Design a protein around this ligand. Structure first.
Ligand SMILES: *[C@H](C)[C@H]1/C(=C/c2[nH]c(/C=C3N=C(/C=C4\NC(=O)C(CC)=C4C)C(C)=C\3CCC(=O)O)c(CCC(=O)O)c2C)NC(=O)[C@@H]1C
Ligand SMILES: CCC1=C(C)/C(=C/C2=NC(=C\c3[nH]c(/C=C4\NC(=O)[C@H](C)[C@H]4CC)c(C)c3CCC(=O)O)/C(CCC(=O)O)=C2C)NC1=O
Ligand SMILES: CCC1=C(C)/C(=C/C2=NC(=C\c3[nH]c(/C=C4\NC(=O)[C@H](C)[C@H]4CC)c(C)c3CCC(=O)O)/C(CCC(=O)O)=C2C)NC1=O
Ligand SMILES: CCC1=C(C)/C(=C/C2=NC(=C\c3[nH]c(/C=C4\NC(=O)[C@H](C)[C@H]4CC)c(C)c3CCC(=O)O)/C(CCC(=O)O)=C2C)NC1=O
Ligand SMILES: CCC1=C(C)/C(=C/C2=NC(=C\c3[nH]c(/C=C4\NC(=O)[C@H](C)[C@H]4CC)c(C)c3CCC(=O)O)/C(CCC(=O)O)=C2C)NC1=O
Ligand SMILES: CCC1=C(C)/C(=C/C2=NC(=C\c3[nH]c(/C=C4\NC(=O)[C@H](C)[C@H]4CC)c(C)c3CCC(=O)O)/C(CCC(=O)O)=C2C)NC1=O
Ligand SMILES: CCC1=C(C)/C(=C/C2=NC(=C\c3[nH]c(/C=C4\NC(=O)[C@H](C)[C@H]4CC)c(C)c3CCC(=O)O)/C(CCC(=O)O)=C2C)NC1=O
Ligand SMILES: CCC1=C(C)/C(=C/C2=NC(=C\c3[nH]c(/C=C4\NC(=O)[C@H](C)[C@H]4CC)c(C)c3CCC(=O)O)/C(CCC(=O)O)=C2C)NC1=O
Lengths: 63, 73, 161, 160, 91, 174, 160, 161, 161, 160, 160, 161
């Protein structure tokens, strides 16, 4: 029911990390806060407000 | 195998180009290199069996330290 | 990373000011709690083995996890499990003794949730093992230092969850 | 180009291109119209160079013509003729760029692996570039044969 | 050993690229590059997986990045994972 | 790896002096012989592997015992190694002629060569012969192509790098 | 900070803090209120240290305030005393930290590259910090100005 | 990786049971097919270069690819292409001889789709080249062993597509 | 990378054609402007330090950035800043002297927007510093060569924005 | 030297000299006599150049010859002009070499560490070498002093 | 030692010792007399600690002195108490050193490989050192046996 | 390496004995001289630059060495020279502050005479430069600490000679 990913002799044989290829720490598919708030049709007024104030800039940071 | 190997080619001599300006480059015939026992190269990948991770890691200690520091001490 | 002192110099520095009376009150707070943090770290250093043993015995063993098909099944997995409990205890002590959990942000909780959700490590069993170490550790170091270690173990549990 | 040689070398050394290098640039920009005249002359004379070249080459080695060779029939001769056109084209590229990046990066790196895959012996390539060189030298001037001559030589050096 | 004392162009260390890493700093970048080599067809070295992902130390990321771009690599996603940002003290 | 220019300039660095008439004369001689040197490099650039196979066939007909079971060039593998080396000698000797200085030969070829061929049981005598079998070929081709474009016939600058490597690799018998 | 240095150390050794290092943290956290006294005195006497240290600097070194000099003019001299104020603030941070890590990372890592990019002689900066060391040692006790003065000595050793 | 034997010890191990009659029947199946796997691997080892030459000749030559404009147009690109066919043939032989395509998951298919979509290697032509190697290889090893190699070449083609 | 020459050989190569009169007109254009680009590269090589000093003095100093709180406030960050201006000047010179900004695509603009948006380098200030280098550099090399450098500095500014 | 640069370059690439490389050697060996003219003139006019350049140096920059400066007194001024004589010699070596390799390796590699170890303002050295540039450009033709003056410009860019 | 560790630390960083580390050396050299008192007391009470700790060891753990254990016999028991004497000596070295480097390099580096090569249960060794810790804490003061007892605790953490 | 403390534990360890009153007298001697060693190391750390400048000015300048033909004649050689004087001063400070010259045996004097006799560095001039550093350093730290520094500088000079 809850198989533990193991390439060889670990257990069931599910490929490692429960994905097609046995690799981990894959590149992130997500984007910055400004980008995800800009991609959606709503939050458009926030993208304008963060554009005006310059808090666009602090949300681009990776903290 | 003889009449297979007489068919094929000269192989390609292995060139060795150095990015640095000072170093000198030297070629080797690929015939000279493939005599002996090939020296295995240990590769680490995210998805591998725990034997293959342990052999690569134990190979790292032998490379950096000149000896195994896990078996001893 | 940063301790409480470095954090004070960060705020006072990033304002451009010097040290005012508030920042000196914060440094006095840290310097009052100094000795307590030291002896707590001494005791945890002494009894780490027993903390991990008692906490694994309470939280994890004789269940589906060490039964076959659970995550703890096989020697390699058991040793990896108790190894991770050792890291949580050690970095929780670092976070206590600095007085600032930034170390837990830098060197532990980074990518750990993606790791455990990648492998299939159960989050809830991990959290309960950490809380078992919180109870046992607070029993060793006492009330005040158990509160301090309690905020850092709770910080890691909040990090995973 | 010569420009690519200098700028990539200056990027490996992390410094600006030095004085000898920029003067060598000014000489290269000085000789500019001559090499254009050479690529025009080598552009006008090709069918003659590939015909005369090719007839010399198949005159030297008739085994490739013969059945059981790699160049029998119509299509395989056409492919060889096509290859001759390509080498002439790369020589004109090496003239106008003034270096070996076009010639090595396009036509000489892994050329052995390709010909040994195609079952084409590479000594025929060597004599092939010999006769391409000879016909091209015949159509060029006297200094001009000295200008274009080492390019074919280095293509043969790629072939060895 | 902070890489910013006595910068070159007249300093006996031959010019090398020098990072803003603090002594023993602990900041790292999660990166995604792609590498096609060039040395392989004349060297005939065994094949390796070119496209990887790793946590590069912040002090030395600078040099790793320049080096990827020198050998025609392409970089996809630079995130700072490990460290805190715009901190005047404490790395 | 200094050429003639940098050799002269380093000499006047050790002195502390400036360039005098003697320096400028020796430089003018170098810049005069350079055109001839370039033509020689174009010759070897044309006919390199022809020179190498000729010095090979001469080498192995003179010393047939290399291909005997006792000998060194006895196998396919050892043979291809030997031809590889002849390609080295021709390449670096070509560098020396344009350079006009035998410092490239010392810094990149000769230093540690006696030790390497002593270590591999490669014989010295065959090696020395191979270098002069290169020297004679390049000499002859330059005499023919010398007399075509008329030329000054003189060939001591061509003999100089090969003579240098022969003098270096040669055990001293007096 | 000393605590930070003590950690990072056993973190890279991946062990708990040793007995020795914990005794060092005890000695540090017991020496705390004396440090806060020192940085209190250097805090509330900053204008005398900057002014008087600037006077001894410009009187010893009439180069930079002469015409055609880096510190020439009222605004340039004010910027000079502004930087002496910076290093005084950083010295107070290094006193309360019990380590020169604040001094090093805020002020010293790459200082020579900056003042060489400004045209400023950095030996004049070191003479200025030495002048503020003499004034700050005139404002304190014996052992006290030994300690604080040795923080100034660290900054002098980094400038030279 | 894992072979069919490792896979059997995985299932019977992960249940905690011993080896029952079913798993022994699976081991008997593999040990019956063993010698066929061996001689097939021997023949493919013998004629690798002719496999690659005939498969490139069937699938890739005399088209837009080797014409200028195509991805195989230069000598560098040609040599890289036939180099990759070498790897597909070698790892397909490993997968055949193990009896389990885990090798192709671990050491081939990993990062290669990202790599070819990065460079601009066409997937379609690659798949057709691999199917050409499947037909040539099946012609060398025969019907049964050609079915075996067929499942592993089809596995790599299913991986890239 | 590629210069103007290599780019012409790329288009003429990828058509399969030889060099016609149009491509020779493009090479004649570059070979006319060659010497001007050489002397411009000579002057910028001579006065790089003064370009960066005058451009930092115009664009960056005595503002919020070098005041505390700004991104240039410390000596570590000042030195990293002027380091980066050095790289922009050097590669802008390579791009000028090649006549083709592909070097700026390969070795500068790659990953740098991700880097600065990760660390917190302000893009605006960077762009204004590059434009200050554009004005100072144009003042050193003159009108025509200043137009050439102007298209490459504007190329970097268009890259980061 | 360009010839040496060409060698080391194809030596690290492990190949014979390319077609492009040879042409650079031709341009260099044909430009030889011109270079030897230039360094002949700056050689035989060196005494005059050292004097006049030093006069313009000390007259433009009265800092270092003032009391308190580095070069105050007879012995010190003589040492100052001794160094200007050194850099003149090195510039002539870089003219005949066709490359700044001699100037760099004799005179520039680690110069800032030496003059920082002597107490010497290196900007004054760069002003001295600029003064010798002006005098040496007064002694030559248009294109001639363009060439030589640009070698002086290299030395000034290494000092700054 | 602490001095050794600091010198090695800034030596690998290739710098002199920071202010922080020099304060650490001051605190160490002022804490000396107390340390020498502790190691004096554990020196002159060694036979009580070895004997009484051996009694509590063998009474808590009747395994190893049973027939069939490792330490069965007169000679074997004597060797067992000999090793407890060794670890007592090494604890005293670690007390005067102010660091567990003596303890680690003399006694702990590769201890498990040795006792696994001897057949000895190393958990019995850790129980023995804990028994000597109880006796040695019975012979000292509060803070005193906190310090020394924590050196014993380091040795127990190395055994387990 | 080893300090005085480690050396005491070495002799007492290698005898098998514990620490007797002689060894405790040696540790009391080191702990009496500790603070003097500290402040001496602090002052040398402050003024290393001036020690090397004054010692090069006394010992090396205006002689055949900096005249052309001498070993300090170029700027590369000058900078390597003063770099080596920096090593002698730094390791002399380490040896002073440890109270045991084993550091000089391990990391400086091993192979240094073979190095300088390989390169062509004059040993005599080096020794005279070190003694100039001895006089200047003793002038900075004073009498007692100058005697201590004196033992270490004389140790290196005895090592080269
Ligand atoms: C040939 C049938 C097709 C083709 C191929 C092609 N490949 C490349 C470049 C690379 N290919 C690889 C492949 C692998 N790496 C692995 O580890 C494995 C598993 C063992 C495989 C299959 C890699 C790493 C590279 C790049 C660097 C390198 O090879 O060392 C190219 C090069 C393209 C370019 O522009 O560089 C080509 C052309 N091309 C076709 O058109 C065919 C369909
Ligand atoms: C301090 C810094 C740090 C931490 C904390 C850390 C955790 C960590 N835990 C891991 C695996 C694991 N972690 C666990 C943990 C658990 N299983 C259980 O059932 C319990 C509930 C739970 C622990 C409380 C297990 C079983 C694995 C092994 C998964 C596998 O690879 O098979 C792995 C993968 C590597 C490996 O162990 O094989 C890492 C990297 N890594 C670090 O660098
Ligand atoms: C731009 C650089 C470049 C070159 C040069 C190139 C050559 C090239 N030559 C080929 C074939 C060939 N080339 C030749 C050439 C010759 N036969 C002889 O005997 C002569 C010595 C010689 C002609 C002078 C022949 C016969 C074939 C086909 C052989 C066969 O298919 O059996 C093929 C096979 C498929 C195809 O042509 O479409 C390529 C790709 N490709 C490139 O990208
Ligand atoms: C077992 C390991 C091994 C083999 C097999 C081998 C072959 C070999 N054959 C050679 C030459 C040769 N090989 C032949 C062979 C032939 N000529 C013909 O017409 C026939 C068709 C054909 C033989 C069937 C000839 C004529 C030469 C001499 C070429 C020359 O140097 O003049 C040479 C060059 C050395 C010399 O003989 O002078 C080697 C090294 N070497 C080895 O170490
Ligand atoms: C917290 C660490 C830190 C420091 C120290 C720092 C210094 C600093 N000094 C500056 C300028 C300067 N600093 C000086 C200093 C001096 N002139 C002399 O002759 C004397 C030797 C010396 C005074 C003792 C001068 C003259 C300038 C301006 C020079 C000019 O603009 O032309 C600037 C230029 C812009 C600005 O000030 O806003 C910075 C950023 N920045 C930092 O973040
Ligand atoms: C060759 C192409 C290339 C570039 C350009 C490059 C830039 C680069 N800039 C960096 C940092 C930085 N760059 C800046 C730059 C600035 N700050 C400002 O306010 C100004 C607008 C601006 C200067 C004009 C600063 C402050 C940092 C460090 C920020 C921090 O670490 O907190 C780093 C981080 C680590 C390191 O430098 O070693 C890289 C890699 N890397 C490359 O490979
Ligand atoms: C071939 C490469 C090379 C150079 C350049 C070189 C320079 C050099 N300059 C020196 C001194 C000096 N150099 C100067 C130079 C100047 N003072 C100023 O104010 C001006 C800016 C400048 C003159 C333009 C002065 C004043 C001294 C002596 C300073 C002193 O002794 O106090 C010394 C000290 C001992 C001696 O000269 O014999 C050397 C070795 N050595 C070399 O091997
Ligand atoms: C200074 C660091 C250091 C240590 C610690 C050390 C230990 C050491 N212990 C030994 C044996 C031994 N040690 C023990 C110890 C024990 N038996 C038990 O059951 C208990 C758990 C434990 C006592 C607390 C025993 C029984 C032997 C002998 C076993 C045998 O010979 O069969 C021996 C074998 C020969 C000999 O003693 O001379 C060494 C060398 N050597 C060193 O250099």
């Amino acid at each position: 029911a809850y198989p533990y990913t193991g390439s060889g002799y670990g257990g069931v044989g599910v490929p490692y990390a429960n994905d097609k290829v046995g690799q981990l720490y894959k590149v992130t598919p997500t984007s910055n806060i400004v980008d995800t708030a800009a991609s959606v049709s709503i939050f458009s007024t926030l993208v304008t407000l963060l554009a005006q104030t310059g808090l666009d800039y602090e949300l681009k940071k990776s903290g | 195998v003889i009449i297979n190997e007489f068919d094929q080619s000269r192989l390609s001599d292995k060139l060795r180009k150095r990015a640095s300006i000072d170093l000198q480059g030297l070629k080797l015939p690929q015939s000279y290199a493939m005599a002996g026992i090939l020296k295995p190269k240990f590769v680490m990948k995210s998805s591998l069996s725990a034997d293959e991770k342990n052999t690569v890691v134990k190979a790292c200690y032998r490379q950096v330290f000149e000896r195994d520091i896990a078996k001893a001490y | 990373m940063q301790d409480a002192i470095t954090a004070v110099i960060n705020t006072a520095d990033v304002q451009g000011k010097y040290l005012d009376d508030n920042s000196l009150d914060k440094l006095r707070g840290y310097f009052e709690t100094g000795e307590l943090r030291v002896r707590a770290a001494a005791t945890i250093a002494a009894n780490a083995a027993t903390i991990i043993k008692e906490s694994v015995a309470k939280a994890l063993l004789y269940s589906d996890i060490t039964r076959p098909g659970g995550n703890m099944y096989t020697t390699r997995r058991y040793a990896a499990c108790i190894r991770d409990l050792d890291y949580y205890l050690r970095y929780a002590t670092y976070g206590m003794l600095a007085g600032d959990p930034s170390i837990l942000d830098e060197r532990v909780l980074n990518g750990l949730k993606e790791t455990y959700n990648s492998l299939g490590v159960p989050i809830g069993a991990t959290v309960q093992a950490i809380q078992a170490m919180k109870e046992v550790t607070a029993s060793l170091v006492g009330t005040n230092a158990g509160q301090e270690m309690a905020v850092y173990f709770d910080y890691i549990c909040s990090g995973l969850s | 180009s010569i420009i690519s040689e200098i700028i990539l070398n200056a990027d490996n050394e992390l410094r600006y291109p030095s004085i000898g290098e920029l003067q060598n640039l000014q000489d290269y920009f000085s000789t500019s119209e001559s090499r254009i005249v050479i690529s025009c002359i080598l552009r006008d004379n090709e069918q003659q160079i590939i015909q005369a070249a090719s007839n010399k080459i198949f005159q030297i080695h008739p085994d490739y013509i013969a059945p059981g060779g790699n160049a029998e029939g119509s299509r395989k001769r056409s492919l060889c003729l096509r290859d001759y056109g390509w080498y002439l084209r790369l020589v004109t590229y090496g003239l106008l760029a003034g270096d070996k990046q076009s010639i090595e990066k396009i036509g000489l790196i892994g050329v052995k692996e390709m010909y040994n895959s195609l079952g084409v012996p590479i000594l025929g390539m060597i004599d092939a570039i010999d006769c391409l060189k000879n016909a091209s030298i015949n159509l060029l001037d006297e200094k001009q044969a000295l200008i274009v001559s080492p390019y074919f030589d280095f293509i043969i050096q790629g072939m060895y | 050993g902070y890489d910013m004392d006595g910068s070159g162009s007249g300093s006996l260390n031959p010019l090398r690229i020098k990072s803003s890493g603090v002594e023993k700093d602990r900041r790292a970048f999660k990166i995604t590059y792609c590498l096609p080599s060039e040395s392989r067809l004349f060297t005939y070295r065994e094949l390796q997986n070119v496209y990887t992902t790793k946590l590069v130390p912040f002090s030395s990321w600078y040099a790793e990045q320049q080096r990827i771009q020198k050998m025609g690599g392409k970089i996809f996603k630079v995130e700072l994972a490990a460290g805190g940002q715009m901190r005047s003290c404490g790395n | 790896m200094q050429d003639t220019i940098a050799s002269i300039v380093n000499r006047y660095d050790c002195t502390g002096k400036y360039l005098d008439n003697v320096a400028i004369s020796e430089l003018e001689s170098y810049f005069s012989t350079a055109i001839i040197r370039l033509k020689v490099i174009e010759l070897i650039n044309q006919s390199s592997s022809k020179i190498i196979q000729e010095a090979a066939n001469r080498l192995y007909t003179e010393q047939p015992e290399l291909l005997r079971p006792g000998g060194n060039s006895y196998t396919t593998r050892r043979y291809s190694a030997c031809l590889r080396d002849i390609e080295y000698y021709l390449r670096y000797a070509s560098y020396a002629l344009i350079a006009g200085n035998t410092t490239i030969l010392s810094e990149r070829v000769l230093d540690g060569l006696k030790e390497t061929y002593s270590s591999l049981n490669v014989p010295i005598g065959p090696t020395v012969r191979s270098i002069q079998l290169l020297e004679d070929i390049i000499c002859n081709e330059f005499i023919i192509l010398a007399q075509k474009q008329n030329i000054s016939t003189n060939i001591t600058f061509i003999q100089q790098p090969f003579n240098y490597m022969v003098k270096y690799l040669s055990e001293k018998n007096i | 900070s000393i605590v930070t240095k003590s950690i990072v150390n056993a973190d890279a050794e991946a062990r708990y803090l040793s007995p020795g290092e914990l005794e060092r943290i005890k000695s540090f956290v017991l020496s705390g209120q004396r440090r806060l006294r020192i940085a209190q005195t250097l805090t509330e006497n900053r204008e005398m240290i900057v002014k008087k240290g600037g006077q001894q600097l410009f009187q010893k070194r009439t180069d930079v305030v002469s015409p055609g000099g880096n510190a020439y003019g009222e605004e340039m001299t004010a910027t000079c005393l502004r930087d002496l104020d910076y290093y005084l603030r950083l010295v107070t941070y290094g006193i309360v930290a019990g380590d020169v890590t604040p001094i090093e990372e805020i002020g010293l890592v790459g200082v020579k590259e900056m003042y060489n990019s400004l045209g400023t002689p950095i030996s004049g900066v070191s003479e200025g910090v030495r002048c503020m060391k003499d004034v700050a040692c005139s404002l304190l006790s014996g052992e006290d100005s030994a300690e604080a003065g040795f923080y100034f000595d660290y900054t002098l050793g980094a400038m030279q």
